Amino acid sequence: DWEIPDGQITVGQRIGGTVYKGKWHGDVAVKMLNVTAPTPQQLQAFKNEVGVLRKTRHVNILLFMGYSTKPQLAIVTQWCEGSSLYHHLHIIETKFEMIKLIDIARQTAQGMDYLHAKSIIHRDLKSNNIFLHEDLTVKIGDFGLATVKSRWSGSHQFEQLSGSILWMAPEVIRMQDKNPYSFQSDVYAFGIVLYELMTGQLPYSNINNRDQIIFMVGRGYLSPDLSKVRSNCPKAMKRLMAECLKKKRDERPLFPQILASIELLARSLPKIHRSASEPSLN
């Protein structure tokens, strides 16, 4: 059992439910439900999020460590040193080499492959929820919208659409099915991540009308302008990005095979600057 007896956790600073840097057997991240009277809906949210994390043990999933109930509802996870992919790409504009960008793609795919393999749909994959831990290891986090695929079609019921629009698949936006989420919707989000990785910018930078983007993407009018990929982007990546971004969700493959395609554009993808001469004896 993963319930942390009250008192042990030592909440500190704030970052962005709500997330604090705390203390419990070292630096940890503490995500709290600030309020005092947890509605049974916020309760099932918590129960569900914990339920999903419990099933994850993989180096590219951010490490769930335990949960607390008594003070406030909270989820404890490993602390990360270093920034989100969002922060690298759009804030400090880190000048990653293309081999690194490909590798970030690769690892992100690795974590997603692992989740889908246990039937977890993340539902909120995006730059911000991808952390470059120690600048070397991609950890996918924030499982606040994560869910496990039910074998039965009538368990679903009604959930108010939430999430960041730039990563939402057209079918999700449209919200016409009982359940428009699928492994494929996660792929689309990862598609937008490829976009940020291969271009350096978010999609639709000329449009600042929020409702317009929701409407035009859901309708099919609007889709990312793939011409904005930087010139050092391997052709295989551009293709792979366009494939993850297909409007017809089924036009998408599984992430195990997606990484297989990411392994395709990798062995001959790079060998660094120039080459290397006779290796001096140590």
Partner: protein, 229 residues
């Protein structure tokens, strides 16, 4: 005494100074006595690491001269600086070849070591060719070709397909084919042949050289994947 000289050179190698080291090793070879296996790698490291440091200067100065694309004293100065460091580059390599073809090539006992010295002088000639463009380029290229056509024979005769030295000769000779002569078919074919051969005796890998062997191996694979693109 020789041992004071080799301890002085080794100590200066530990201090990341490659001028007193090269002077001490030139003073070693000027005695005209035959080296060991150990005393040789120090000489190659001194005249090799310093040469690499000199090269990096040439590469970045030449890039800063092909990125300016104007007509002023900035690139006037670049040339005045490029010919300066190139002449410095020329003086070092001529000192190496003069120290090499007068005490070591003829005065050697190990055939592996004789092949090694041919790898060293040939690599130096290839490096000289990879920068001097004009009438003087032809002779350096011919010397590099002669070095390649003599070390490769003894490698195919009396070496292992998994030895470090034969692998290093294959590596340097392949990058010679790719950069100097620009025939990537032949150099690429040679690299493929090396991959087919170096694989054969993978079982025959003793502790004396595993790190070197696999290091040249992955370098060979990286050059291959660069060139087949």
């Amino acid at each position: 005494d020789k041992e004071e000289l080799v301890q002085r050179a080794k100590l200066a190698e530990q201090a990341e100074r490659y001028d007193d080291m090269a002077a001490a090793m030139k003073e070693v070879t000027e005695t005209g006595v035959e080296l060991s296996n150990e005393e040789r790698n120090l000489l190659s490291v001194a005249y090799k690491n310093v040469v690499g440091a000199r090269r990096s200067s040439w590469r970045v100065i030449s890039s800063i001269e092909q990125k300016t694309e104007g007509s002023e004293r900035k690139q006037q100065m670049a040339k005045e600086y490029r010919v300066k460091v190139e002449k410095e580059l020329r003086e070092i390599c001529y000192d190496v070849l003069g120290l090499l073809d007068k005490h070591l090539i003829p005065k050697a006992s190990n055939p592996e070591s004789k092949v090694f010295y041919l790898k060293m002088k040939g690599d130096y000639y290839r490096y000289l060719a990879e920068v001097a463009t004009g009438e003087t380029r032809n002779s350096v290229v011919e010397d590099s070709q002669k070095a390649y056509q003599d070390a490769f024979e003894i490698s195919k005769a009396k070496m292992q397909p998994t030895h470090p030295i034969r692998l290093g000769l294959a590596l340097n000779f392949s990058v010679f084919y790719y950069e100097i002569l620009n025939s990537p078919d032949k150099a690429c074919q040679l690299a493929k042949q090396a991959f087919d051969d170096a694989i054969a005796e993978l079982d025959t890998l003793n502790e004396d050289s595993y790190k070197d062997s696999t290091l040249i191996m992955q370098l060979l694979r990286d050059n291959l994947t660069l060139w087949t693109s």
